[PDB]
mmCIF file of C-alpha atoms in Angstrom:
data_model
loop_
_atom_site.group_PDB
_atom_site.id
_atom_site.type_symbol
_atom_site.label_atom_id
_atom_site.label_comp_id
_atom_site.label_asym_id
_atom_site.label_seq_id
_atom_site.Cartn_x
_atom_site.Cartn_y
_atom_site.Cartn_z
ATOM 1 C CA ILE C 1 -272.647 9.610 56.558
ATOM 2 C CA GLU C 2 -272.012 7.083 59.015
ATOM 3 C CA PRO C 3 -274.968 8.114 61.736
ATOM 4 C CA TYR C 4 -277.327 8.743 58.562
ATOM 5 C CA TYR C 5 -276.756 5.280 57.057
ATOM 6 C CA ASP C 6 -277.009 1.561 58.851
ATOM 7 C CA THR C 7 -276.151 -1.440 57.252
ATOM 8 C CA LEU C 8 -274.251 -4.657 58.144
ATOM 9 C CA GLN C 9 -266.266 -4.779 55.956
ATOM 10 C CA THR C 10 -268.057 -7.473 58.196
ATOM 11 C CA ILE C 11 -269.386 -9.034 54.959
ATOM 12 C CA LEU C 12 -266.369 -9.415 53.496
ATOM 13 C CA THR C 13 -265.101 -11.282 56.563
ATOM 14 C CA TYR C 14 -267.915 -13.708 55.524
ATOM 15 C CA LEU C 15 -267.687 -13.553 52.155
ATOM 16 C CA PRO C 16 -265.118 -16.099 51.027
ATOM 17 C CA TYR C 17 -266.616 -18.784 53.422
ATOM 18 C CA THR C 18 -269.689 -18.114 51.274
ATOM 19 C CA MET C 19 -268.007 -18.019 47.528
ATOM 20 C CA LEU C 20 -266.398 -21.170 47.828
ATOM 21 C CA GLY C 21 -270.226 -22.925 48.505
ATOM 22 C CA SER C 22 -270.125 -23.027 52.160
ATOM 23 C CA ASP C 23 -272.817 -21.888 55.221
ATOM 24 C CA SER C 24 -272.005 -19.042 56.458
ATOM 25 C CA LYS C 25 -272.957 -17.578 59.706
ATOM 26 C CA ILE C 26 -274.960 -15.013 58.061
ATOM 27 C CA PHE C 27 -275.985 -16.631 54.546
ATOM 28 C CA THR C 28 -277.526 -20.038 55.043
ATOM 29 C CA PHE C 29 -277.894 -22.120 51.549
ATOM 30 C CA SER C 30 -281.250 -24.157 51.675
ATOM 31 C CA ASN C 31 -283.225 -26.593 49.245
ATOM 32 C CA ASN C 32 -280.526 -28.579 48.412
ATOM 33 C CA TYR C 33 -278.384 -25.397 47.680
ATOM 34 C CA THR C 34 -280.573 -23.883 44.885
ATOM 35 C CA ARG C 35 -281.041 -20.661 46.841
ATOM 36 C CA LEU C 36 -279.548 -18.188 49.154
ATOM 37 C CA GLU C 37 -281.282 -16.361 51.848
ATOM 38 C CA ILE C 38 -279.583 -12.778 52.565
ATOM 39 C CA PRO C 39 -280.131 -11.995 56.089
ATOM 40 C CA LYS C 40 -281.764 -8.956 57.373
ATOM 41 C CA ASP C 41 -279.967 -5.553 57.970
ATOM 42 C CA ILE C 42 -278.968 -5.642 54.278
ATOM 43 C CA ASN C 43 -280.383 -2.538 52.978
ATOM 44 C CA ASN C 44 -281.993 -2.152 49.346
ATOM 45 C CA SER C 45 -278.592 -1.172 47.929
ATOM 46 C CA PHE C 46 -276.254 -4.072 49.093
ATOM 47 C CA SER C 47 -278.872 -6.689 48.207
ATOM 48 C CA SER C 48 -279.311 -5.930 45.001
ATOM 49 C CA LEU C 49 -275.276 -5.797 44.290
ATOM 50 C CA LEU C 50 -274.967 -9.132 46.174
ATOM 51 C CA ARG C 51 -277.822 -10.748 44.341
ATOM 52 C CA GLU C 52 -275.178 -10.193 41.396
ATOM 53 C CA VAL C 53 -271.958 -11.287 43.303
ATOM 54 C CA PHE C 54 -274.075 -14.494 44.785
ATOM 55 C CA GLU C 55 -274.537 -15.986 41.112
ATOM 56 C CA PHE C 56 -270.688 -17.330 40.920
ATOM 57 C CA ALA C 57 -271.514 -19.003 44.633
ATOM 58 C CA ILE C 58 -274.999 -20.724 43.819
ATOM 59 C CA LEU C 59 -273.387 -21.848 39.982
ATOM 60 C CA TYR C 60 -269.904 -22.974 41.551
ATOM 61 C CA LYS C 61 -272.016 -24.945 44.257
ATOM 62 C CA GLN C 62 -274.280 -26.500 41.791
ATOM 63 C CA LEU C 63 -271.189 -27.422 39.385
ATOM 64 C CA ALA C 64 -269.680 -28.769 42.725
ATOM 65 C CA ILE C 65 -272.323 -31.242 43.285
ATOM 66 C CA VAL C 66 -272.283 -32.262 40.059
ATOM 67 C CA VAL C 67 -268.343 -32.668 39.557
ATOM 68 C CA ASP C 68 -268.863 -34.639 43.448
ATOM 69 C CA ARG C 69 -271.385 -36.777 41.990
ATOM 70 C CA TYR C 70 -270.923 -38.561 38.926
ATOM 71 C CA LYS C 71 -266.724 -38.411 39.589
ATOM 72 C CA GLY C 72 -266.518 -42.307 39.090
ATOM 73 C CA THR C 73 -270.331 -43.287 38.455
ATOM 74 C CA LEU C 74 -270.745 -42.916 34.441
ATOM 75 C CA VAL C 75 -269.680 -45.277 32.594
ATOM 76 C CA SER C 76 -269.493 -43.528 29.048
ATOM 77 C CA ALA C 77 -265.997 -42.224 27.828
ATOM 78 C CA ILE C 78 -267.480 -38.868 26.574
ATOM 79 C CA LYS C 79 -269.035 -37.719 29.366
ATOM 80 C CA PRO J 1 -259.021 -23.268 76.340
ATOM 81 C CA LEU J 2 -262.645 -23.932 75.544
ATOM 82 C CA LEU J 3 -263.655 -23.331 72.057
ATOM 83 C CA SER J 4 -266.664 -21.598 73.054
ATOM 84 C CA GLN J 5 -264.628 -19.136 75.176
ATOM 85 C CA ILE J 6 -262.794 -18.099 72.001
ATOM 86 C CA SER J 7 -264.969 -15.607 69.531
ATOM 87 C CA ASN J 8 -262.503 -14.817 67.236
ATOM 88 C CA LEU J 9 -262.480 -16.079 64.304
ATOM 89 C CA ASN J 10 -258.855 -15.839 63.320
ATOM 90 C CA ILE J 11 -257.739 -17.552 66.540
ATOM 91 C CA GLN J 12 -260.326 -20.418 66.249
ATOM 92 C CA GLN J 13 -258.734 -20.601 62.695
ATOM 93 C CA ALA J 14 -255.143 -21.070 63.690
ATOM 94 C CA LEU J 15 -255.994 -23.312 66.776
ATOM 95 C CA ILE J 16 -258.055 -25.786 64.248
ATOM 96 C CA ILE J 17 -255.340 -25.646 61.720
ATOM 97 C CA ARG J 18 -252.817 -26.914 64.682
ATOM 98 C CA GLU J 19 -255.474 -29.120 65.436
ATOM 99 C CA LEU J 20 -255.634 -30.150 62.162
ATOM 100 C CA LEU J 21 -252.001 -31.058 61.102
ATOM 101 C CA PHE J 22 -252.252 -33.917 63.446
ATOM 102 C CA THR J 23 -255.555 -34.910 62.234
ATOM 103 C CA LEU J 24 -254.667 -36.052 58.571
ATOM 104 C CA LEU J 25 -252.351 -38.623 60.031
ATOM 105 C CA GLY J 26 -254.985 -39.987 62.020
ATOM 106 C CA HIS J 27 -254.481 -38.505 65.599
ATOM 107 C CA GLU J 28 -257.148 -37.286 67.794
ATOM 108 C CA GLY J 29 -256.849 -33.576 68.533
ATOM 109 C CA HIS J 30 -258.344 -31.503 71.266
ATOM 110 C CA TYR J 31 -261.229 -30.366 69.209
ATOM 111 C CA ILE J 32 -261.410 -32.863 66.798
ATOM 112 C CA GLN J 33 -262.130 -36.198 68.131
ATOM 113 C CA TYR J 34 -262.543 -40.238 66.835
ATOM 114 C CA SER J 35 -266.522 -41.240 66.858
ATOM 115 C CA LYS J 36 -267.648 -43.736 69.281
ATOM 116 C CA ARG J 37 -268.136 -46.321 66.912
ATOM 117 C CA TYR J 38 -264.310 -46.575 65.852
ATOM 118 C CA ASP J 39 -263.041 -49.621 67.308
ATOM 119 C CA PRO J 40 -259.657 -50.604 67.077
ATOM 120 C CA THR J 41 -259.858 -54.037 67.560
ATOM 121 C CA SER J 42 -262.069 -54.968 64.793
ATOM 122 C CA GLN J 43 -260.376 -55.667 61.577
ATOM 123 C CA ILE J 44 -263.135 -54.026 58.935
ATOM 124 C CA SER J 45 -262.794 -50.935 61.454
ATOM 125 C CA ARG J 46 -259.396 -49.849 61.191
ATOM 126 C CA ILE J 47 -258.813 -50.957 57.571
ATOM 127 C CA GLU J 48 -262.324 -48.114 57.023
ATOM 128 C CA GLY J 49 -260.542 -46.079 58.891
ATOM 129 C CA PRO J 50 -261.762 -43.735 61.752
ATOM 130 C CA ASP J 51 -264.777 -41.532 61.826
ATOM 131 C CA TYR J 52 -264.518 -38.320 63.428
ATOM 132 C CA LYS J 53 -266.638 -35.880 65.408
ATOM 133 C CA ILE J 54 -266.335 -32.107 65.249
ATOM 134 C CA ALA J 55 -266.613 -29.625 68.484
ATOM 135 C CA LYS J 56 -269.975 -27.982 68.377
ATOM 136 C CA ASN J 57 -268.461 -24.623 69.161
ATOM 137 C CA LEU J 58 -266.517 -24.141 65.992
ATOM 138 C CA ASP J 59 -267.734 -21.515 63.991
ATOM 139 C CA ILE J 60 -270.507 -23.226 60.711
ATOM 140 C CA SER J 61 -268.312 -22.243 57.967
ATOM 141 C CA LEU J 62 -265.136 -23.341 59.579
ATOM 142 C CA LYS J 63 -266.800 -26.435 60.986
ATOM 143 C CA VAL J 64 -268.053 -27.072 57.123
ATOM 144 C CA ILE J 65 -264.231 -26.925 55.748
ATOM 145 C CA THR J 66 -263.082 -28.821 58.628
ATOM 146 C CA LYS J 67 -265.502 -31.895 57.616
ATOM 147 C CA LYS J 68 -264.370 -31.686 54.202
ATOM 148 C CA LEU J 69 -260.803 -32.145 54.920
ATOM 149 C CA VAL J 70 -261.420 -34.687 57.888
ATOM 150 C CA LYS J 71 -261.931 -37.438 55.273
ATOM 151 C CA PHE J 72 -258.376 -36.830 54.396
ATOM 152 C CA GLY J 73 -256.949 -38.427 57.760
ATOM 153 C CA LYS J 74 -259.320 -41.221 57.446
ATOM 154 C CA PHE J 75 -257.798 -42.158 54.467
ATOM 155 C CA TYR J 76 -254.403 -42.165 55.536
ATOM 156 C CA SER J 77 -255.148 -43.961 58.718
ATOM 157 C CA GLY J 78 -256.937 -46.519 56.632
ATOM 158 C CA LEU J 79 -254.066 -47.194 54.414
ATOM 159 C CA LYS J 80 -251.375 -47.370 57.221
ATOM 160 C CA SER J 81 -253.657 -49.923 58.821
ATOM 161 C CA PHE J 82 -253.567 -51.710 55.422
ATOM 162 C CA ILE J 83 -250.439 -52.356 55.053
ATOM 163 C CA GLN J 84 -250.066 -53.588 58.590
ATOM 164 C CA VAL J 85 -252.256 -56.390 57.648
ATOM 165 C CA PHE J 86 -252.421 -57.541 53.894
ATOM 166 C CA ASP J 87 -248.740 -57.590 53.885
ATOM 167 C CA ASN J 88 -247.409 -61.151 54.738
ATOM 168 C CA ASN J 89 -247.015 -64.544 52.776
ATOM 169 C CA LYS J 90 -250.118 -65.575 52.569
ATOM 170 C CA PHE J 91 -251.826 -62.899 50.465
ATOM 171 C CA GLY J 92 -249.394 -63.511 47.481
ATOM 172 C CA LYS J 93 -247.115 -61.311 45.415
ATOM 173 C CA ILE J 94 -249.848 -59.432 43.856
ATOM 174 C CA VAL J 95 -251.161 -57.895 47.278
ATOM 175 C CA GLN J 96 -247.774 -57.611 48.400
ATOM 176 C CA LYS J 97 -246.152 -55.680 45.581
ATOM 177 C CA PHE J 98 -249.525 -53.593 45.799
ATOM 178 C CA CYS J 99 -248.884 -52.837 49.360
ATOM 179 C CA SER J 100 -245.515 -51.593 48.179
#
C-alpha cells in the first residue's frame, strides 16, 4: 500500500513531547493552550484518530496550568 | 560542534543532557549561557540566582523542556550564594540555624 497511500513512525517521534503539554515541531498550541493545530500531510483518517488522542494532551495542559497557577495563592484550606 | 550543524534528535538530546548536568549546579555550558543581566557583583543578583538563555538552534520541544528544568539551577545557585552571605554573627542565631 505504501506507493498508493501518502501521509507523514515519525508521528510517534514527536508525540511524547506533545502529550506532556509542550510545543512540537509538527504540533503547535495556540490561544493560551486552548486549541491544537493538526498540520498538513496528515490525511483524514489519521487526523480523526489523533483528535481523540489529543484530548488527553489539551486536558492535561489545562490541569497543569491550573496547578502551576494556584499552587500557593489560594488561602482556603479546602481548595 | 555548532548546535545548528547537528540535525539528529538523539544527538541533540544527549548533548543537552550533558550540558544540563552542569547547568543544574549553577555552571555555564556550551549551549546554556548566563543572561547578560546577571552581574555577580550585585548582592541581590547573586541571591536571586542567574537567568539562563538557551541557544536558538535547539529543537523546539527540547527547548521548552529545558526552559522548565533550568529553574532548578537558578534556585541552587541562589541558595549557595545565600549561605555565603547570611551565615555570620550579625544576622543572629535564627538565620544561622536556617542556613544550616
